[PDB]
RNA sequence: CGCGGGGUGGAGCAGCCGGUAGCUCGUCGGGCUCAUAACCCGAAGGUCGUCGGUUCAAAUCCGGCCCCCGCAACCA
RNA sequence: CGCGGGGUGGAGCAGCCGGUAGCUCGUCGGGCUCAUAACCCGAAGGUCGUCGGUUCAAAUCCGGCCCCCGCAACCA
RNA sequence: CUUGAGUCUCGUAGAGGGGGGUAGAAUUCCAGGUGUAGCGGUGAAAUGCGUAGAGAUCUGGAGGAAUACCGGUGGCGAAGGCGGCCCCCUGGACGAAGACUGACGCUCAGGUGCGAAAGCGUGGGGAGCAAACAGGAUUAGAUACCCUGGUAGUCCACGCCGUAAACGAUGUCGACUUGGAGGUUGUGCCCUUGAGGCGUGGCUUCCGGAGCUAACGCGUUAAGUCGACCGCCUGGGGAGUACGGCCGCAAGGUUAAAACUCAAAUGAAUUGACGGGGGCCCGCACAAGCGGUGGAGCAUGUGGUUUAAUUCGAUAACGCGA
RNA sequence: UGAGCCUUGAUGUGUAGGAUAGGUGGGAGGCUUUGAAGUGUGGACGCCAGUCUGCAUGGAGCCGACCUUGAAAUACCACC
């Protein structure tokens, strides 16, 4: 907004692992304020993922996230007659969010049956460095690279 | 703006110096001026207008200054 | 090809496009590169970054000649002016002289008419 | 009839040694875009005309056939 | 009468081999638009003048007829 | 007679004029070298130029036009205008003292001359720029703006044209009336003790007093206070046009009506509103996000059409009065 | 500057692999004081693994069927 920047609201860490990031992810996943179901789904995804990759539940998730975080995104300035997409260094708070969102989107897209399962699959893909979220990230990066002349 | 890098001089410093020299020359400005033909009248007008502006800045503003703002 | 230690970099910096040309000290061109050639078109090639990359390309091209010392001659107004020379420096030549060589007439030919935009 | 070019991904131009199997525009997805095009990324389209053989590499070298070219010569 | 162009979607200009059946403005539809002219998306309008035949491709090659053109020649 | 007007003496500054030389930078072209795939251009493109070697880069040559910096609300000129440097011919201005002439002055209808740019004639020249023209864009169209080219013309000589917002939109000459800050160019004195100090002349930029003015503003360079002479105006349109004359190669110029027609037309300033003017600021206004509507079926209101009637109203109206 | 030729040299990565296998026939040891393996490197090619070769140093050994393989050694060889 114009007038005043405001302090981001307080977020509680999830009961299972005691993590803020996890909680955020769960929130993102959630729909129609049905938090509980969403959190259950998330947990399920984690468990399966853990089983698959070993490690811990949280650590694996973190790793997955890491492979889909964008260093740089673009924005539309359009000062000229035609529009110029300009790259911008995307901040720590935002980058984490974006990756999560992308992952969620991928999960939603995916052709597997249960939501949780789909999510798990997505996570696995991210970890391995294939899939939808990763592709999206690449695209984002690619665009930035293309428009690197603007800065 | 001919320049020679001195012995044990940094590159950046040299570049800066060059830039300064260029500025002094007013080469870029000159180039800009000669990009397109300015009608004599237009040239005259700008010069006089600019002068007028300068005069305004010098005297009127000085007068204003005498009186405090708050 | 005969290797040469010292040469000139001519940097033709226009408003629309930068052209870097490395030559020997006598005048004979060794290699060249351009912002338009480096994979930039229109809005993109009239930028400092583009110029820099052109410069880099040029440098790469004159690797076989084995050029260590380099004097730079900068021509025209543009973005590709400071940037290009920086790029050249990075590429790793000892920059010896940095000259400006913009053609300034002493009121000679009539320029074209002013654009109405 | 004889003699020089050779025969391909919707069309076209594909790196002297047979192991590289394409690039442009095109159609679809997406990215950006006010737009459209340009621009970025990726994706479906083969026989290498054909019949064979020298060889694990063959369309990729050769024997014949069908055509496209080009040849220049002929015609009671 | 003889001889050259050919005959279409409300009008007009439609890719040498008969298998492609259009594009402009127009009317409707809806939001853009301070307003419409809009940009953009989609939608109704055929016979291919006609009578036949070579052929599964025909209006699309040919035989005749009706007109539109153009022809240049004629006229007691 | 000497105070106006002029002449003489010595200096002064000046893009004042005419003529003839020359210098350096840059553009263009030509010839050649190096070199290799782009160049160019725009908001974005394309036309255009490029592998027949462009663009870039260096060497040599040709030719034309204009004179960076100095350079300034600086200077000179009656105005138009005048800008590298040098020479030749040449007009004016100002100051310093004296000396002389002795009203010789001011203004000026007709008349005469000079008079930007474009334009015309004849002969030269032609680099760059560029009306016309052509193509490429843009667009509903684009006979424009933008891009790529491009011929008259711009340049020179000698003629003609005789007009421009030829403006300070302010005729010329003279006298008189408070001030300040400069610029420029002389000149007198003063220890120039220093770039200074005190004057006194010319031209000039800005601000402002009295006064003047419709106001805006002008204000010792008047638009103040007066005198001399001339030019010009008499509502807007029709019209600076027609006819006639004079001038012109022509383009056209100049002089200059009438009918008819409207009750306005204008100037300055004022309050608003508006601006694809400018500054500052705000709002789920955008941006950042989440969920919808627009497609489906149904509910519901409206438009329409239908009906004997489909009650009337709302149209920031349309699950609204209800 | 193009381009032939008597001649004597070099040149040749399907994967199995000692690793830059053109093919046929005569063949089990060719070269080494008109100087063998290891070292220093000047110039070439290149699929970056290496290959051929000049001059220096060194002075008494490297390479064979080999294990594999559609085809066996550049152990000598002539034909191209």
From Swiss-Prot, chain C:
<dbReference type="GO" id="GO:0070181">
    <property type="term" value="F:small ribosomal subunit rRNA binding"/>
</dbReference>
<keyword id="KW-0689">Ribosomal protein</keyword>
<dbReference type="GO" id="GO:0006412">
    <property type="term" value="P:translation"/>
</dbReference>
<dbReference type="InterPro" id="IPR001971">
    <property type="entry name" value="Ribosomal_uS11"/>
</dbReference>
<dbReference type="GO" id="GO:0005829">
    <property type="term" value="C:cytosol"/>
</dbReference>
<keyword id="KW-0488">Methylation</keyword>
<comment type="function">
    <text>Located on the platform of the 30S subunit, it bridges several disparate RNA helices of the 16S rRNA. Forms part of the Shine-Dalgarno cleft in the 70S ribosome.</text>
</comment>
<dbReference type="InterPro" id="IPR018102">
    <property type="entry name" value="Ribosomal_uS11_CS"/>
</dbReference>
<keyword id="KW-0699">rRNA-binding</keyword>
<keyword id="KW-0694">RNA-binding</keyword>
<comment type="similarity">
    <text>Belongs to the universal ribosomal protein uS11 family.</text>
</comment>
<keyword id="KW-0687">Ribonucleoprotein</keyword>
<dbReference type="GO" id="GO:0003735">
    <property type="term" value="F:structural constituent of ribosome"/>
</dbReference>
<protein>
    <recommendedName>
        <fullName>Small ribosomal subunit protein uS11</fullName>
    </recommendedName>
</protein>
<dbReference type="GO" id="GO:0022627">
    <property type="term" value="C:cytosolic small ribosomal subunit"/>
</dbReference>
<dbReference type="Pfam" id="PF00411">
    <property type="entry name" value="Ribosomal_S11"/>
</dbReference>
<dbReference type="InterPro" id="IPR019981">
    <property type="entry name" value="Ribosomal_uS11_bac-type"/>
</dbReference>
<dbReference type="InterPro" id="IPR036967">
    <property type="entry name" value="Ribosomal_uS11_sf"/>
</dbReference>
<dbReference type="GO" id="GO:0005737">
    <property type="term" value="C:cytoplasm"/>
</dbReference>
<comment type="subunit">
    <text>Part of the 30S ribosomal subunit. Interacts with proteins uS7 and bS18. Cross-links to IF-3. In stalled ribosomes contacts ribosome rescue factor SmrB.</text>
</comment>
<dbReference type="GO" id="GO:0002181">
    <property type="term" value="P:cytoplasmic translation"/>
</dbReference>
């Amino acid at each position: 907004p114009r007038r005043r920047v405001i302090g981001q609201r307080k977020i509680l860490p999830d009961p299972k692992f005691g993590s803020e990031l996890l909680a955020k992810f769960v929130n993102i996943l959630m729909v129609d304020g049905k938090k509980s179901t969403a959190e259950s789904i998330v947990y399920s995804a984690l468990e399966t993922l853990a089983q698959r990759s070993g490690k811990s539940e949280l650590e694996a998730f973190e790793v997955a996230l890491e492979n889909v975080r964008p260093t740089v995104e673009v924005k539309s300035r359009r000062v000229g007659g035609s529009t110029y997409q300009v790259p911008v260094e995307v901040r720590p708070v935002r980058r984490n969010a974006l990756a999560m969102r992308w992952i969620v989107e991928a999960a939603r897209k995916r052709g597997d049956k249960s939501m949780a399962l789909r999510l798990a699959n997505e996570l696995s893909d991210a970890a391995e460095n294939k899939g939808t979220a990763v592709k999206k990230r690449e695209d984002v990066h690619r665009m930035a690279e293309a428009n690197k002349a603007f800065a | 703006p001919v320049i020679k890098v001195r012995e044990n001089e940094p590159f950046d410093v040299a570049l800066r110096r060059f830039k300064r020299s260029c500025e002094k020359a007013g080469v870029l400005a000159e180039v800009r001026r000669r990009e397109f033909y300015e009608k004599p009248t237009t040239e005259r007008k700008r010069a006089k207008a600019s002068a007028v502006k300068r005069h305004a800045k010098k005297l009127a503003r000085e007068n204003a200054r005498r009186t405090r703002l708050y | 090809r005969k290797q040469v230690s010292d040469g000139v970099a001519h940097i033709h910096a226009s408003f629309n496009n930068t052209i870097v040309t490395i030559t020997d000290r006598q005048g004979n061109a060794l290699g060249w590169a351009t912002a338009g050639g480096s994979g930039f078109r229109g809005s993109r090639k009239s930028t400092p970054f583009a110029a820099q990359v052109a410069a880099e390309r040029c440098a790469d091209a004159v690797k076989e000649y084995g050029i260590k010392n380099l004097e730079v001659m900068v021509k025209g107004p543009g973005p590709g002016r400071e940037s290009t020379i920086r790029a050249l420096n990075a590429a790793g030549f000892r920059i010896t002289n940095i000259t400006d060589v913009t053609p300034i007439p002493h009121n000679g030919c009539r320029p074209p008419k002013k654009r109405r935009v």
